[PDB]
Design an enzyme around this catalytic site. Structure first.
Site, PDB file in Angstrom:
ATOM      1  N   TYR A   1     -14.336   1.405   6.928  1.00 56.27           N
ATOM      2  CA  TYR A   1     -12.993   1.280   6.397  1.00 56.27           C
ATOM      3  C   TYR A   1     -12.135   0.840   7.560  1.00 56.27           C
ATOM      4  O   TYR A   1     -11.246   0.001   7.418  1.00 56.27           O
ATOM      5  CB  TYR A   1     -12.508   2.628   5.863  1.00 56.27           C
ATOM      6  CG  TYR A   1     -12.513   2.714   4.352  1.00 56.27           C
ATOM      7  CD1 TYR A   1     -12.508   3.944   3.699  1.00 56.27           C
ATOM      8  CD2 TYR A   1     -12.511   1.557   3.574  1.00 56.27           C
ATOM      9  CE1 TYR A   1     -12.506   4.015   2.303  1.00 56.27           C
ATOM     10  CE2 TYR A   1     -12.503   1.618   2.182  1.00 56.27           C
ATOM     11  CZ  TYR A   1     -12.504   2.845   1.553  1.00 56.27           C
ATOM     12  OH  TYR A   1     -12.540   2.890   0.180  1.00 56.27           O
TER      13      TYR A   1
ATOM     14  N   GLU B   1      -2.442  15.785   1.184  1.00 58.11           N
ATOM     15  CA  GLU B   1      -3.690  16.323   1.725  1.00 58.11           C
ATOM     16  C   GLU B   1      -3.444  16.287   3.222  1.00 58.11           C
ATOM     17  O   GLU B   1      -3.440  15.224   3.841  1.00 58.11           O
ATOM     18  CB  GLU B   1      -4.897  15.451   1.384  1.00 58.11           C
ATOM     19  CG  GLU B   1      -6.207  16.232   1.454  1.00 58.11           C
ATOM     20  CD  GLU B   1      -7.442  15.378   1.250  1.00 58.11           C
ATOM     21  OE1 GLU B   1      -8.491  15.944   0.872  1.00 58.11           O
ATOM     22  OE2 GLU B   1      -7.364  14.151   1.477  1.00 58.11           O
TER      23      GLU B   1
ATOM     24  N   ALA C   1      -3.935  17.081  -3.137  1.00 50.67           N
ATOM     25  CA  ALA C   1      -3.775  15.658  -3.382  1.00 50.67           C
ATOM     26  C   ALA C   1      -3.904  15.319  -4.875  1.00 50.67           C
ATOM     27  O   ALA C   1      -2.934  14.896  -5.515  1.00 50.67           O
ATOM     28  CB  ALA C   1      -4.808  14.906  -2.584  1.00 50.67           C
TER      29      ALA C   1
ATOM     30  N   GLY D   1      -0.253   7.839   0.920  1.00 49.86           N
ATOM     31  CA  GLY D   1      -1.627   8.039   0.485  1.00 49.86           C
ATOM     32  C   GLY D   1      -2.570   7.962   1.666  1.00 49.86           C
ATOM     33  O   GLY D   1      -2.322   7.190   2.584  1.00 49.86           O
ATOM     34  N   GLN D   2      -3.636   8.751   1.674  1.00 49.63           N
ATOM     35  CA  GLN D   2      -4.566   8.695   2.791  1.00 49.63           C
ATOM     36  C   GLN D   2      -4.783   7.258   3.190  1.00 49.63           C
ATOM     37  O   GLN D   2      -4.545   6.886   4.337  1.00 49.63           O
ATOM     38  CB  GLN D   2      -5.924   9.290   2.439  1.00 49.63           C
ATOM     39  CG  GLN D   2      -6.956   9.024   3.514  1.00 49.63           C
ATOM     40  CD  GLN D   2      -8.292   9.636   3.211  1.00 49.63           C
ATOM     41  OE1 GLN D   2      -9.005   9.181   2.314  1.00 49.63           O
ATOM     42  NE2 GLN D   2      -8.653  10.673   3.957  1.00 49.63           N
ATOM     43  N   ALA D   3      -5.229   6.443   2.241  1.00 50.57           N
ATOM     44  CA  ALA D   3      -5.491   5.040   2.521  1.00 50.57           C
ATOM     45  C   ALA D   3      -4.308   4.354   3.191  1.00 50.57           C
ATOM     46  O   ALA D   3      -4.423   3.863   4.307  1.00 50.57           O
ATOM     47  CB  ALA D   3      -5.846   4.335   1.254  1.00 50.57           C
TER      48      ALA D   3
ATOM     49  N   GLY E   1      -3.987   9.360  -5.863  1.00 46.72           N
ATOM     50  CA  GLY E   1      -3.122  10.384  -6.412  1.00 46.72           C
ATOM     51  C   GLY E   1      -1.798  10.330  -5.673  1.00 46.72           C
ATOM     52  O   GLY E   1      -0.747  10.108  -6.266  1.00 46.72           O
TER      53      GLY E   1
ATOM     54  N   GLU F   1      13.886 -13.769   2.845  1.00 50.83           N
ATOM     55  CA  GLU F   1      13.261 -15.082   2.686  1.00 50.83           C
ATOM     56  C   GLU F   1      12.104 -15.013   1.708  1.00 50.83           C
ATOM     57  O   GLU F   1      12.046 -15.768   0.738  1.00 50.83           O
ATOM     58  CB  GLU F   1      12.731 -15.590   4.021  1.00 50.83           C
ATOM     59  CG  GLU F   1      13.769 -15.821   5.075  1.00 50.83           C
ATOM     60  CD  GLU F   1      13.947 -17.287   5.391  1.00 50.83           C
ATOM     61  OE1 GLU F   1      12.925 -18.006   5.452  1.00 50.83           O
ATOM     62  OE2 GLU F   1      15.107 -17.716   5.593  1.00 50.83           O
TER      63      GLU F   1
ATOM     64  N   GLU G   1      -9.232   5.768 -11.451  1.00 52.99           N
ATOM     65  CA  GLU G   1      -8.553   4.622 -10.831  1.00 52.99           C
ATOM     66  C   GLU G   1      -7.548   3.880 -11.716  1.00 52.99           C
ATOM     67  O   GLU G   1      -6.371   3.857 -11.402  1.00 52.99           O
ATOM     68  CB  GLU G   1      -9.601   3.646 -10.288  1.00 52.99           C
ATOM     69  CG  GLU G   1      -9.047   2.322  -9.762  1.00 52.99           C
ATOM     70  CD  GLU G   1      -9.359   2.100  -8.282  1.00 52.99           C
ATOM     71  OE1 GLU G   1      -8.901   2.920  -7.458  1.00 52.99           O
ATOM     72  OE2 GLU G   1     -10.059   1.117  -7.942  1.00 52.99           O
TER      73      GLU G   1
HETATM   74  N1  GTP Z   1      -8.566  -1.155   2.783  1.00 52.16           N
HETATM   75  C1  GTP Z   1      -8.664   0.136   2.644  1.00 52.16           C
HETATM   76  N2  GTP Z   1      -8.800   0.679   1.435  1.00 52.16           N
HETATM   77  C2  GTP Z   1      -8.892   2.048   1.466  1.00 52.16           C
HETATM   78  C3  GTP Z   1      -8.872   2.881   2.591  1.00 52.16           C
HETATM   79  N3  GTP Z   1      -8.995   4.201   2.231  1.00 52.16           N
HETATM   80  C4  GTP Z   1      -9.098   4.175   0.930  1.00 52.16           C
HETATM   81  N4  GTP Z   1      -9.036   2.909   0.400  1.00 52.16           N
HETATM   82  C5  GTP Z   1      -9.121   2.538  -1.023  1.00 52.16           C
HETATM   83  O1  GTP Z   1      -8.025   3.163  -1.711  1.00 52.16           O
HETATM   84  C6  GTP Z   1      -8.528   3.932  -2.834  1.00 52.16           C
HETATM   85  C7  GTP Z   1      -8.679   5.371  -2.458  1.00 52.16           C
HETATM   86  O2  GTP Z   1      -7.534   6.186  -2.640  1.00 52.16           O
HETATM   87  P1  GTP Z   1      -7.792   7.754  -2.211  1.00 52.16           P
HETATM   88  O3  GTP Z   1      -8.173   7.857  -0.790  1.00 52.16           O
HETATM   89  O4  GTP Z   1      -8.773   8.305  -3.189  1.00 52.16           O
HETATM   90  O5  GTP Z   1      -6.446   8.418  -2.489  1.00 52.16           O
HETATM   91  P2  GTP Z   1      -5.050   8.361  -1.869  1.00 52.16           P
HETATM   92  O6  GTP Z   1      -4.425   7.139  -2.523  1.00 52.16           O
HETATM   93  O7  GTP Z   1      -5.063   8.441  -0.416  1.00 52.16           O
HETATM   94  O8  GTP Z   1      -4.255   9.653  -2.516  1.00 52.16           O
HETATM   95  P3  GTP Z   1      -4.953  10.964  -3.252  1.00 52.16           P
HETATM   96  O9  GTP Z   1      -5.696  10.561  -4.522  1.00 52.16           O
HETATM   97  O10 GTP Z   1      -3.937  12.008  -3.736  1.00 52.16           O
HETATM   98  O11 GTP Z   1      -5.885  11.509  -2.188  1.00 52.16           O
HETATM   99  C8  GTP Z   1      -9.900   3.373  -3.137  1.00 52.16           C
HETATM  100  O12 GTP Z   1      -9.785   2.276  -4.015  1.00 52.16           O
HETATM  101  C9  GTP Z   1     -10.396   2.988  -1.752  1.00 52.16           C
HETATM  102  O13 GTP Z   1     -11.358   1.936  -1.866  1.00 52.16           O
HETATM  103  C10 GTP Z   1      -8.739   2.294   3.848  1.00 52.16           C
HETATM  104  O14 GTP Z   1      -8.692   2.879   4.926  1.00 52.16           O
HETATM  105  N5  GTP Z   1      -8.633   0.886   3.800  1.00 52.16           N
HETATM  106 MG    MG Z   2      -5.867  11.428   0.260  1.00 52.54          MG
END
Ligand code: GTP
Ligand code: MG
Ligand code: TA1
Ligand code: GDP
Ligand code: ADP
Ligand code: MG
Ligand code: ZN
Lengths: 412, 426, 323
Positions: free
Chosen positions: A197, A44, A72, A9-11, A117, A227, A156
């Protein structure tokens, strides 16, 4: 010995780039040194591209960077079933190609963002296909579950009640770091209303370094990945402990840095410092893995903890006499050259299972219903190879996760 | 990913010139020139709107559909007019009569095949298609009729790729046409059942927002258009840029449409301050949400304050704190709990690009799915009946091979569409 | 307007088949009363629950008999067969078209319409017209004329919907109707490579329009009864070409989801019902909800293997919360 990692996931990828940064940073391996030991998945392109364009560009193999130019979609279904499917094979291939090359591994540290996603769906089946291909290992998934009030995606919960039920019967130990409850730390314990972020990432990027990095690293009280799950999960539910760090002091403002153990350990149980909006509102701890690093005298610990064991207002479960896994490492933490992290000579990354999440899950489940109760964005999944089944039947799922986290505690 | 714009009718066309006037500069593409881009990032994702042929000629991948030569011959004889490959111009030298029926059943129906032809040449361009952008006005022939057909065909050819629709719903106070509700009711009908994202703009919601939110005293059309085009750039193109938290048509779609109707939104831009003076820079962020979420400033005619929201998408694009963004959104969601619907714990869909509008420091497109837009289709639907009842200028439709049951159909449909939308306001 | 949501739901379980027994499946459905089935400890009540040996006659008397009377009374109605593939939808809606014991709902309905007519035959002048079409990929094809493909729904002068250009055939006897059904069933193979795949993924819709005029009284009556054999509700397990070791991509059928939303809306007493969500619900608009009677027969395999699918079916049926 090792532990692969799949940032999904991007995040999970942004956090990945971060945790991956802190790494070399404390191992003296600049931009272009050795070779990572993980992979990157996303539907993505533009995001994984950031790892292909930005910093730590050549420290990866275009082979451990999986992308699906396609779409995505902030919806589980599509990412899990429909689209996400096409990539999985290929994905696996790397975690089978990277899993082979090594020498007697221990597991895969998975990095995903519950409510996304590509993060919820996909992984769901990635971890899914792992639990079968390597049931004989550790599956610790490091998640960033839904901000208690500051969520982003409109759906969400749909995406997070679904990543929980599908992964539940597949993970070993699921670490949790709440995006919002980390902001508080950036406001209250570091002072900055400008948290990019890129910061929260530096943080988990820290707490995580305390997990694998340093632990898999020699010390006075080593703690293997296994462990964890052993000393950390009382029951098969892929139980989710919470991550917490101690010296989260600002490298500019205040300066009392020299905060002997006796202090940094007490600073873990105060609810305003735990990367999770699950304030111990009642949740009885049932096992904590106090991972220390830096200059720490075992007695200091086997005392600082003793003092705690007798604070009572910190009430531990009944069926649990002692639930304190003391993990001592040598090398102190390693703060970004000039971010905003203090830089002490000792820290406490304590994680734990707390009957507290009885809340967090509750509050996130309820969400779901409200919308499902009206089908809200349901047509978005159905039309993506899902059914009234998967939802309703994954709701019932968590239901017994609200009872589970209730029964294993609150009762004697 | 990709998309293929569609300039249906004159309006939809006139706007094309403004949407492309902008977008290009937001991508450093001179008339026929190439990428002069002040940066290097305004290029890694262009594809979404262009095609590689020469090496300095990235041609906009849109379609120009119209039954009135003079129009496209004004857009093609002016500024950026010479960047579209002639193949793009699908004209209909016929009589572009102001009849929905004349551009949907009799005159347009012919020119259609010669359009779909190209809409396929462009779709089968390369890589992967996302969806198509559609501009037009629901108050004329080549707009509501022929453009509303173009989609009904598009949505049969790729029920996979998305369909954003930018409609210039008939402004209230004064109608720039007479049958307006006829050409309108008939096109909304087609919309509620093909495109899956519609952004309704009102020539008079703009004036207002352009004469009081921009002390602008002589708001020419070019302007209105310009303002609009400003929003559609924040939407699409924008998200096809990096971001801490980026989305894309689908996210936007999959977070904004609770129920399949397709639902229509109401776009709102962020920094909307008069030139010199106003250049207050009060754009820390609370200032942008202050903006975006007020009544005035909603390109729509209706006022949000007159009906809950189902979804909202603040698509910001300028370096900011995922904290001061994610945070603000909240208070906003609590100060106005009243109107924001409840069965959605987090109506708002925070989106965050990085690079901002070329010359600005921080902006944020707003795409609201409020139940307020009920009070517009009502309007339209009213105007219909009041005149349908007497079959007013109906002979211009029927006499063009139409049906007395066709008008019935649309009104009802679109009329029911009003109904439903209330099912959530409650 | 009669009662708002005159929707009855009956759950019909069929006997375990030889393939299920051969596989080693077990009978997981437990029963209580004449309206409750228990799966995985959870109870699901409905207007009625038919055990594995219920007869076609019992299903017709409980599920369609009264609706047929309403149609002859001049009202509209709808009867659906919902469930996963092989659950028993076709067996229920048509069964053995010419076997007096094994015939399904449709044959028995035709039989009762004509029999009623024969007992009238005094001052009433009847006129029965039928239509038979299918919906595949949200596209309508005339089963009585294979040239009529991708037809469109339209509303007439008086709002009543209709399928533009769909064959309407005047029938005068049960045999004529069965011949019509038989023709539709043969026509269905046209341009279809795999009939198994096609039948499980498409919706069959048979319409019976009964018009009558009492030559003396002059009061006219017209009723439409739509008989629908829906596509399989089981989206899961789609085999074929896609992500080999990486797939789970498939949505719930567009018409089934549209039907779900329509039923839930009616169950909620909502003034606005989302008929436009699909061509099917749009065509059925004047015969589903409102002042129309509607019976949904959800069919299920009692197999341990189809436990999750059965749960889904049961849940769908529950969308019509009765009292
Ligand atoms: N700690 C942290 N949380 C993040 C970051 N990027 C996104 N998030 C959180 O993760 C969620 C966002 O997920 P998205 O970026 O929409 O989606 P994805 O999980 O990458 O996958 P797709 O929906 O298919 O794009 C939200 O709740 C954001 O607050 C990051 O760099 N750090
Ligand atoms: Mg993404
Ligand atoms: C010296 C200086 O800073 O000038 C600013 C300026 O004064 C202001 C008033 C601009 C100005 O915009 C208008 O006056 C305006 C005119 C007609 C319709 C709508 C707006 C500006 O013209 C617009 C221009 O916008 C951009 O450059 C964006 O990239 C924008 N571009 C266009 O709309 C565009 C215009 C002409 C040709 C090609 C593109 C954009 C916005 C969203 C998405 C893509 C692009 C900016 C910042 C300014 C000027 C030049 C005075 C403002 O508008 C925008 C869209 O930024 C009006 O309120 C804002 C606040 C700005 O500070
Ligand atoms: N914003 C905007 N509206 C326009 C423009 N041109 C025509 N309109 C609006 O479009 C409606 C008239 O339809 P028109 O575009 O002439 O139809 P067509 O050309 O026959 O397809 C009126 O409501 C006008 O206000 C324009 O350049 N910008
Ligand atoms: N109630 C039943 N009694 C005996 N056999 C049954 C029963 N219901 C279904 N079957 C048989 O199982 C097979 C598959 O059933 P069918 O109705 O064709 O399924 P579908 O739901 O796919 O339409 C058929 O031979 C059918 O006659
Ligand atoms: Mg069948
Ligand atoms: Zn000090």
């Amino acid at each position: 010995r090792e532990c692969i990692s799949i940032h999904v996931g991007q995040a999970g990828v942004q956090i990945g780039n971060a945790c991956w940064e802190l790494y070399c940073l404390e191992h003296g391996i600049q931009p272009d040194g050795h070779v990572p030991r993980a992979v990157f998945v996303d539907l993505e392109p533009t995001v994984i591209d950031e790892v292909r364009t930005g910093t730590y560009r050549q420290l990866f193999h275009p082979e451990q960077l999986i992308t699906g130019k396609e779409d995505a979609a902030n919806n589980y279904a599509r990412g899990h079933y429909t689209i996400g499917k096409e990539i999985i094979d290929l994905v696996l291939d790397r975690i089978r190609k990277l899993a082979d090359q090594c020498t007697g591994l221990q597991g895969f540290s998975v990095f995903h963002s519950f409510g996304g996603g590509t993060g919820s769906g996909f992984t769901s089946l990635l971890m899914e296909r792992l639990s079968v291909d390597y049931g004989k290992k550790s599956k610790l998934e490091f998640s960033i579950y839904p901000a208690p009030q500051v969520s982003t995606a409109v759906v969400e919960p749909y995406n997070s009640i679904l990543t929980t039920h599908t992964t539940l019967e597949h993970s070993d130990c699921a670490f949790m770091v709440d995006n919002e409850a980390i902001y508080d730390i950036c406001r209250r314990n570091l002072d900055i209303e400008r948290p990019t972020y890129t910061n929260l990432n530096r943080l988990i990027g820290q707490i995580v370094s305390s997990i694998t990095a340093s632990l898999r690293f020699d010390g006075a009280l080593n703690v293997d990945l296994t462990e964890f799950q052993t000393n950390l999960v009382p029951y098969p539910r892929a139980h989710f402990p919470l991550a917490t760090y101690a010296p989260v002091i600002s490298a500019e403002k205040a300066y009392h840095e020299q905060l002997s153990v006796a202090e940094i350990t007490n600073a873990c149980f105060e609810p305003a410092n735990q990367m999770v909006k699950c304030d111990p509102r009642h949740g009885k701890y049932m096992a904590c893995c106090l991972l220390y690093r830096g200059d720490v005298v075992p007695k200091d610990v086997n005392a600082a903890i003793a003092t705690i064991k007798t604070k009572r207002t910190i009430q531990f479960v009944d069926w649990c006499p002692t639930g304190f896994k003391v993990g001592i490492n040598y090398e102190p933490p390693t703060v970004v050259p000039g971010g905003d992290l203090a830089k002490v000579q000792r820290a406490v990354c304590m994680l734990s299972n707390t009957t507290a999440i009885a809340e967090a899950w509750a509050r996130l489940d309820h969400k779901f219903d409200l919308m499902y109760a009206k089908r809200a964005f349901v047509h978005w999944y159905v039309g993506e190879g899902m059914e009234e089944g998967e939802f309703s039947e994954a709701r019932e799922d968590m239901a017994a996760l609200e009872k589970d986290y209730e029964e294993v505690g609150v009762d004697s | 990913r990709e998309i293929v714009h569609i300039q249906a009718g004159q309006c939809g066309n006139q706007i094309g010139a403004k949407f492309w006037e902008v977008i290009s500069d937001e991508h450093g593409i001179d008339p026929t020139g190439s990428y002069h881009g002040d940066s290097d990032l305004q290029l890694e994702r262009i594809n979404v709107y262009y095609n590689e042929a020469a090496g300095n000629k990235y041609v906009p991948r849109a379609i120009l559909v119209d039954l009135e030569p003079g129009t496209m011959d004004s857009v093609r004889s002016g500024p950026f007019g010479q960047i579209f490959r002639p193949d793009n111009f699908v004209f209909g030298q016929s009589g572009a009569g102001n009849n929905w029926a004349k551009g949907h059943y009799t005159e347009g129906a012919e020119l259609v095949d010669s359009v779909l032809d190209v809409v396929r040449k462009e779709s089968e361009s390369c890589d992967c298609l996302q969806g198509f952008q559609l501009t037009h006005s629901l108050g004329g022939g080549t707009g509501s009729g022929m453009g509303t057909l173009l989609i009904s065909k598009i949505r049969e050819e790729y029920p996979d790729r998305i369909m954003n629709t930018f409609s210039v719903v008939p402004s209230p106070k004064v109608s720039d046409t007479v049958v307006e509700p006829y050409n309108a009711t008939l096109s909304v009908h087609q919309l509620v059942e093909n495109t899956d994202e519609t952004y309704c703009i009102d020539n008079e919601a703009l004036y207002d927002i352009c004469f009081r939110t921009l002390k602008l005293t002589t708001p020419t059309y070019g302007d209105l258009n310009h303002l609009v085009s400003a929003t559609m750039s924040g939407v699409t193109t924008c998200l096809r840029f990096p971001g801490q938290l980026n989305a894309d048509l689908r996210k936007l779609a999959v977070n904004m449409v609770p129920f399949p109707r397709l639902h229509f939104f109401m776009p709102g831009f962020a920094p909307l301050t008069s030139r010199g003076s106003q250049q207050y820079r009060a754009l820390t962020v609370p200032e942008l949400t202050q903006q975006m979420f007020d009544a005035k400033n909603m390109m729509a005619a209706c006022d949000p304050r007159h009906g809950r929201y189902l979804t909202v998408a603040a698509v910001f694009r300028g370096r900011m704190s995922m904290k001061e963004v994610d945070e603000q959104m909240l208070n906003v969601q609590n100060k106005n709990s009243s109107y924001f619907v409840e069965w959605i714990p987090n109506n708002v869909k925070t989106a965050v690009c990085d690079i901002p509008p070329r010359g600005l420091k921080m902006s944020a497109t707003f795409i609201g799915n409020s139940t307020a837009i009920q009070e517009l289709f009502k309007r339209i639907s009213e105007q219909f009946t009041a005149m349908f009842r007497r079959k007013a200028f109906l002979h211009w439709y029927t006499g063009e091979g139409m049906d007395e049951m066709e008008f019935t159909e649309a009104e009802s449909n679109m009329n029911d569409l009003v109904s439903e939308y209330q099912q959530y306001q409650d | 307007d009669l009662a708002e949501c005159n929707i009855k739901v009956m759950c019909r379980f069929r006997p375990l088949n030889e393939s299920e027994v051969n596989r080693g499946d077990k009978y997981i459905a437990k029963f209580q009363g004449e309206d409750t089935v228990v799966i995985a400890s959870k109870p699901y009540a409905f207007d009625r629950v038919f055990q594995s040996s219920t007869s076609q006659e019992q299903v017709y008397n409980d599920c369609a008999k009264k609706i047929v009377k309403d149609v002859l009374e001049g009202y509209n109605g709808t009867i659906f067969a919902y469930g996963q593939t092989s659950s028993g939808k076709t067996h229920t809606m048509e069964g053995k078209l010419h076997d007096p014991e094994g015939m399904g709902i449709i044959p028995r309905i035709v039989q009762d319409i004509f029999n009623y007519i024969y007992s009238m035959d005094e001052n009433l002048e009847f006129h029965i017209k039928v239509s038979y079409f299918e919906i595949y990929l949200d596209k309508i094809r005339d089963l009585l004329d294979v040239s009529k493909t991708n037809l469109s729904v339209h509303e007439d002068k008086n709002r009543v919907p209709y399928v533009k250009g769909c064959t309407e055939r005047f029938v005068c006897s049960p045999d004529e109707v069965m011949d019509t059904i038989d023709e539709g069933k043969s026509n269905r193979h046209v341009a279809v490579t795999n009939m198994n795949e096609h039948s499980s993924r498409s919706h069959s819709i048979f319409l019976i329009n009964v018009k009558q005029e009492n030559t003396q009284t002059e009061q006219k009556l017209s009723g439409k009864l739509y008989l629908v054999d829906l596509a399989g509700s089981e989206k899961v397990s789609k085999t074929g070409a896609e992500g080999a070791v990486l797939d789970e991509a498939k949505n719930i059928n567009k018409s089934l989801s549209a039907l779900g939303n329509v039923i839930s809306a009616l169950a909620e007493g909502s003034t606005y019902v989302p008929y436009r969500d699909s061509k099917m619900t749009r065509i059925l608009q004047d015969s589903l909800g409102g002042n129309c009677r509607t019976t949904i027969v959800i069919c299920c395999s009692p197999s341990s293997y189809n436990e999750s699918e059965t749960k889904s079916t049961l849940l769908f049926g529950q969308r019509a919360k009765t009292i």
